[PDB]
Nucleic acid binder design. Structure first.
Length: 21
DNA sequence: GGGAAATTCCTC
DNA sequence: GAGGAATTTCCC
C-alpha cells in the first residue's frame, strides 16, 4: 500500500456547507 | 431503523 | 487528460 488510497466516504464531522439543492 | 449530502477513486 | 460513479457518515 505505497499509495495512501482513502476509501470513498464523507469525513467525520463534515457538516453541510450550504443549501444542497 | 431510513434518508440525504459530501468526498473520493476509476474508466475511456 | 477530464469526467462520471460508488461509498461512507450523521440526524431524527
Amino acid at each position: 500500500v505505497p499509495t495512501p488510497k482513502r476509501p470513498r466516504g464523507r469525513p467525520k464531522g463534515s457538516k453541510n456547507k450550504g443549501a444542497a439543492k
